[PDB]
Every structure is written in C-alpha cells, then in structure tokens.
Symmetry: C3
Subunit: 55 residues, 3 copies
C-alpha cells in the first residue's frame, strides 16, 4: 500500500540526518513519521513545509 511505502521514505532520510548530528531535522521526521502512520497526513504537510521553506 501507499502509506507503508511512505513510511519507507521518511525512514531513509531521517536516519541520514541523525548521522550528521542534525537534531533539528532528526527530531522533526520523528514527528512527521508518526503523523503519516496514524493518518494525520494533513498535519504532517504543515509541519514539514516550514522546514523546507526555512532550509
């Protein structure tokens, strides 16, 4: 299904920014991953959008 495929993508990028010692982008995709999994897809986009806009 689509959602567990999404759960794959967040896992790849989240681990990558944990290595770089990025505890502002690693803590963030911990939040986004939970929202996608529970079904709060709308809130996930709002949370992620500000980071992309900023950096």
């Amino acid at each position: 299904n689509e959602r567990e495929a999404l759960l794959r993508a967040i896992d790849i990028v989240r681990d990558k920014y944990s290595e770089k010692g990025d505890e502002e982008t690693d803590t963030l995709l911990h939040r986004v991953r939970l929202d996608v999994r529970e079904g709060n897809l709308e809130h996930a986009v709002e949370d992620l959008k500000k980071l992309v806009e900023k950096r």
Copy 2:
C-alpha cells in the same frame, strides 16, 4: 469512548498552534497526544503542567 474524545480534543488545539509557528507548544502536544494514546496519562500531566505554569 473516553480516550477517543481526548485524542480529538488535543488535535483541535494542536493544529491551532502549528499555523501560529509555535514550535514549543506544537512539539509539546505531539508528546501529550502519544502519552494519552498509549495509556500513560500520569506522565502527560507532568509534561503538560510545566508548560501551563510557564505560559
């Protein structure tokens, strides 16, 4: 259900504080939602009450 009503109520306030760009409150209600959703409410009021007294 008792816990289902609580879960929606946190979502109402949580969304309201992500649009305002508040990354202290919006981050905090991510944790409080998970504490209630899992069955550890006593730790939720420990995390929640410190924000209320501070703000």
Copy 3:
C-alpha cells in the same frame, strides 16, 4: 515478551529524569521508547549513543 522488558526499563529511567525537570534527556527517551516499540532498534541505539558520549 522481551521488548516489553525493554519498554519497562525505559519507563523507570524516563520518570527518574522528569522529577529533575531535565527536558533534554526526557524528550529523548520519548523517542527511544517509540523506536523500540515499533522495531527501529537500530536507530534507537544511534539516537541514544550521542547523548551517552556528551554526558
């Protein structure tokens, strides 16, 4: 269940770090318990490793 034993261990130390009001360590073991509860044990050790080295 052996994962339940790990989850109990995280609880004991997590509440031990909420009385002191340590909001660096406490928010960290929120993520670690979430990592262990789902199966991302490989990320949990890397997440917790950084805290051990500093402190």
